[PDB]
């Protein structure tokens, strides 16, 4: 029993992190097979960050201007290209620690583990959600760019995030491993603002199921609701609309607990309208939305990775 | 910027986890050099758990009754002994993945990373504190026994926890790697109760400093206090008494922020007496006590591990 924000074991990703230096700028890269992936703003000076023309800046860069270091050892860069907002550095050595992996562009509401790195060295690991406004609430300092987010499915690492930047209110923006930003963000030091940070309703419901499974049941009430009536309350509280697909996805947790999804929505409705009256659920005084239904099943059934 | 519950990268510990089976019971062991460490209740049946005589049960066990599996491969057990509440299985192969390591018995209020394992396979990683009542608030299911807690200091893994059992209210008890339980717990299925769960005051103060560093400053008030006057308020709210040693330990965060520890205590006093009025600090609606001063400095300065 117990329920914690749990990251995937990071060992398979630790063996892929390297340091990339171009001129004065050092950040992290991802070494898979004979390619290093890194944020393209590695080629920028601080001045350049204000209004960069990446194609123009890249003309002044050759293979030998990229220093790539795997622990204490330099890799030889034999080619480079820009794909959207990432550079791909072809190196003459395949990473012998390359795991089975895929590149995935995740949907908003999905979770992943971040391995925060500095100078190609892992600092720490934590769980994040892709928020509805396509930001993440990370912990990133200067030097953390190129840190990656991932999920593990038994043996296979699905890389879904590379860290590029921080927005006002200290939330974070980045790309998939094809270099396409999540949301409307650009890799320029220019005024950009996150939209409304809406709550991931289906994840809050998943977490309420986790609470029940752990014997935290005080919030289970005597009411039910409809999707349409529940969604009139969600709209007011900046909750994502709940759909039938969401109800389907909560099927395993609903079946395990014997609590109909719409009965759990009616419990959520009362928590939104009345607050928690100074009570806690799984040690939290707020409604948690960074656990997916899969995260709850995985933690409550003990799914492992090899 | 941003502040998250952050685990150490787990790769160095993943390469030490094995599966130990004795009769019908399977749990996790820790393979360092030519020794496997595991909970001694691996030798018990369910019946035995009610009132076990471990010395007597062990007489019926030989080297060949312990099956130890590192991934897909069996290790040969050439010796066994019981040290307090752990078994030490001598195997004929030194783990080639053994990191630099130490065994440390941590103090209450200290934090560590848990790598939750099932059948010798890592499931996930998360941060925990040793609570004042010598419990941890983990996520552990049947099969998780032998999972370990650790800290990393650059290259060196300090193992401080091995998981043995769950108490009522779904908190967890275990041993150091010499097999001595933290607190008064025994490895018997008998009525045992946790004492009062007191709050780690110095850690709450460390987290308030983390909030300031991140620009969350609304709670900074106009008052100061004394250690003795602050401690009269802590006693009422089941906070640990703050000592001069604690004030010394908060020195780096106090110096970085320019906020005197006793001024931060006066802010904490007002939060304890008035509550948060529905406001949040680093996205929390409660006072967090599972970050040490070191955890805050480490996260806010980007300390890495190799
Ligand atoms: C990254 O390059 C690195 N070396 O780690 C760096 C990571 C930042 C630093 C603080 N927290 C982080 O996550 N990323 C950057 O410095 C990117 C880079 C240029 C600026 N930038 C930023 O993240 C800016 N933010 C903005 O410009 C957006 C704004 C103005 C709306 C806040 C800040 C000011 C450094 C945070 C580019 C190419 C985007
Ligand atoms: C461990 O052996 C394993 N195979 O993973 C197991 C882990 C538990 C299961 C549920 N959550 C966990 O952390 N540990 C045990 O089963 C230990 C073991 C015998 C009983 N036990 C327990 O943890 C008991 N708890 C108690 O007996 C204490 C009590 C009665 C005060 C609650 C429970 C009932 C299974 C949780 C021994 C030797 C302690």
Swiss-Prot record, chains A, B:
<feature type="domain" description="Peptidase C30">
    <location>
        <begin position="1"/>
        <end position="306"/>
    </location>
</feature>
<comment type="subunit">
    <text>3CL-PRO exists as monomer and homodimer. Only the homodimer shows catalytic activity. Interacts with host FBXO22; this interaction promotes the proteasomal degradation of nsp5.</text>
</comment>
<feature type="active site" description="For 3CL-PRO activity">
    <location>
        <position position="41"/>
    </location>
</feature>
<feature type="cross-link" description="Glycyl lysine isopeptide (Lys-Gly) (interchain with G-Cter in ubiquitin)">
    <location>
        <position position="90"/>
    </location>
</feature>
<feature type="topological domain" description="Cytoplasmic">
    <location>
        <begin position="1"/>
        <end position="306"/>
    </location>
</feature>
<protein>
    <recommendedName>
        <fullName>3C-like proteinase nsp5</fullName>
    </recommendedName>
</protein>
<comment type="function">
    <text>Cleaves the C-terminus of replicase polyprotein at 11 sites. Recognizes substrates containing the core sequence [ILMVF]-Q-|-[SGACN]. Cleaves and inactivates human TRMT1, preventing tRNA guanine(26)-dimethylation of tRNAs. May cleave human NLRP1 in lung epithelial cells, thereby activating the NLRP1 inflammasome pathway. May cleave human GSDMD, triggering alternative GSDME-mediated epithelial cell death upon activation of the NLRP1 inflammasome, which may enhance the release interleukins 1B, 6, 16 and 18. Also able to bind an ADP-ribose-1''-phosphate (ADRP).</text>
</comment>
<feature type="cross-link" description="Glycyl lysine isopeptide (Lys-Gly) (interchain with G-Cter in ubiquitin)">
    <location>
        <position position="5"/>
    </location>
</feature>
<feature type="active site" description="Nucleophile; for 3CL-PRO activity">
    <location>
        <position position="145"/>
    </location>
</feature>
């Amino acid at each position: 029993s117990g329920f914690r924000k749990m990251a995937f074991p990071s060992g398979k990703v630790e063996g892929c992190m390297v340091q990339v230096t171009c001129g004065t700028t050092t950040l992290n890269g991802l070494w898979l097979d004979d390619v290093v992936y890194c944020p393209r703003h590695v080629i920028c000076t601080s001045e350049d960050m204000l209004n960069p023309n990446y194609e123009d800046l890249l003309i002044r860069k050759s293979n030998h201007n990229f220093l790539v270091q795997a622990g204490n050892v330099q890799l030889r860069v034999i080619g480079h290209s820009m794909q959207n907002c990432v550079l791909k550095l072809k190196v003459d050595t395949a990473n012998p620690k390359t795991p089975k992996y895929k590149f995935v562009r995740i949907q908003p509401g999905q979770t992943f583990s971040v391995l925060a790195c500095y100078n190609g060295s892992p600092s720490g690991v934590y769980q994040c959600a892709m928020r509805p406004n396509f930001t993440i609430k990370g912990s990133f300092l200067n030097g953390s760019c190129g840190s990656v987010g991932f999920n593990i499915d038994y043996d296979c690492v699905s890389f879904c995030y590379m860290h590029h930047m921080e927005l006002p209110t200290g939330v974070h923006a980045g790309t998939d491993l094809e270099g396409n930003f999540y949301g409307p963000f650009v890799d320029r030091q220019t005024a950009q603002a996150a939209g409304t940070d809406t709550t991931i309703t289906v994840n809050v419901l998943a977490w309420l199921y986790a609470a029940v499974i752990n014997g935290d049941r005080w919030f289970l009430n005597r009411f039910t609701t409809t999707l349409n009536d529940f969604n009139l309350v969600a709209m007011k509280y900046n909750y994502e609309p709940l759909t039938q697909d969401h109800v389907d996805i909560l099927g395993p947790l609903s079946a395990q607990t014997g609590i109909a999804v719409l009965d759990m929505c009616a419990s959520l409705k009362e928590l939104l309208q009345n607050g928690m009256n100074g009570r806690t659920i799984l040690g939290s005084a707020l409604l948690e939305d960074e656990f997916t239904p899969f995260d709850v099943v995985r933690q409550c059934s003990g799914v492992t990775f090899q």
